[PDB]
Amino acid sequence: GHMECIKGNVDLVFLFDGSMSLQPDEFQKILDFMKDVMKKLSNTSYQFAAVQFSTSYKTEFDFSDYVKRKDPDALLKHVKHMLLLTNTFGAINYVATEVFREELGARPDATKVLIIITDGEATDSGNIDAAKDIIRYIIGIGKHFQTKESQETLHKFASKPASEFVKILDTFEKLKDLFTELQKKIYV
Ligand SMILES: [Mg+2]
């Protein structure tokens, strides 16, 4: 029950896949999921940042942007789908070093949470030692995670145990349902 153990201030980053496999409506459903989560946790001790990744990495908004403009529709208005590869290792290192920074609104007393949303196996390699103080929850969606073997490639990015921190969805429509399952775990 590690998700139920989180208490107090939480700095949560969405790391979302903008790879070439995604159809326009699928990309939009990822955006809507992030908006739904932010709206439901509005006015709690949560604050949010969001990073799109594909071949390279872009901070769509920093924690300090969220604090000023606490409006999910406005914060994500300008997102452009990158349509390239899936460099997940680099992306996690980007979040750990470029996003969780006090200069950008990160709080020193906040538990660090990373929700990763992806529709494919990573196209890079490396390590994520830099993320060892981040709780990592990964959502893998769609046909590229049909096989058990592909599902297990995500375990190396997630916190342990995989049974808690790796969620496989067969379609993008299940994101709405996942949202509901997650609210019951998160204490506010
Ligand atoms: Mg993909």
Side-chain angles (χ1 to χ4, degrees):
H2 286 292
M3 296 291 292
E4 290 92 347
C5 297
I6 304 174
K7 302 286 167 68
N9 287 343
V10 178
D11 285 350
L12 187 148
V13 177
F14 299 101
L15 181 60
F16 65 101
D17 179 326
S19 65
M20 63 177 74
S21 56
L22 290 160
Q23 302 305 298
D25 70 294
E26 299 172 340
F27 189 73
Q28 182 60 50
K29 284 178 172 78
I30 295 173
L31 295 184
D32 291 338
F33 172 83
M34 296 184 290
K35 294 201 249 201
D36 286 357
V37 174
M38 289 192 270
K39 291 176 193 268
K40 178 61 102 178
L41 296 173
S42 187
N43 261 23
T44 64
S45 46
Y46 275 71
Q47 73 189 13
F48 299 92
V51 173
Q52 183 184 179
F53 78 102
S54 190
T55 289
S56 67
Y57 326 105
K58 183 181 193 277
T59 299
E60 299 295 1
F61 63 89
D62 285 304
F63 296 116
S64 55
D65 299 316
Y66 174 78
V67 161
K68 297 189 326 224
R69 268 289 256 150
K70 196 163 143 273
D71 176 3
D73 292 311
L75 284 164
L76 288 172
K77 205 190 171 167
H78 299 302
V79 175
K80 288 228 193 111
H81 187 188
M82 287 169 168
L83 280 164
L84 294 167
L85 296 169
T86 313
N87 284 338
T88 313
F89 280 96
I92 292 170
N93 279 285
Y94 179 95
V95 170
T97 62
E98 300 287 356
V99 177
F100 281 114
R101 295 188 76 97
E102 283 192 47
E103 300 85 338
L104 301 175
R107 296 165 296 178
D109 61 354
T111 304
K112 304 180 178 170
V113 176
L114 181 51
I115 294 177
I116 304 178
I117 308 150
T118 185
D119 82 336
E121 288 177 44
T123 48
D124 62 353
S125 59
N127 73 88
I128 52 164
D129 288 348
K132 70 160 159 117
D133 74 325
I134 305 173
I135 295 170
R136 290 162 276 115
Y137 186 98
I138 183 156
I139 303 163
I141 309 168
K143 71 174 175 177
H144 295 285
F145 294 114
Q146 271 162 359
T147 72
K148 174 185 128 84
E149 291 65 36
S150 65
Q151 293 173 19
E152 293 189 341
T153 68
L154 300 179
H155 295 195
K156 49 179 164 282
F157 302 121
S159 289
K160 301 173 170 164
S163 61
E164 175 164 19
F165 286 103
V166 176
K167 188 79 197 193
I168 301 298
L169 311 187
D170 57 3
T171 76
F172 285 82
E173 303 273 17
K174 299 289 181 61
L175 273 173
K176 283 270 213 126
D177 307 328
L178 182 67
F179 168 42
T180 313
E181 164 185 339
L182 256 173
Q183 327 165 211
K184 301 175 175 178
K185 286 169 160 359
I186 292 174
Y187 177 89
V188 291

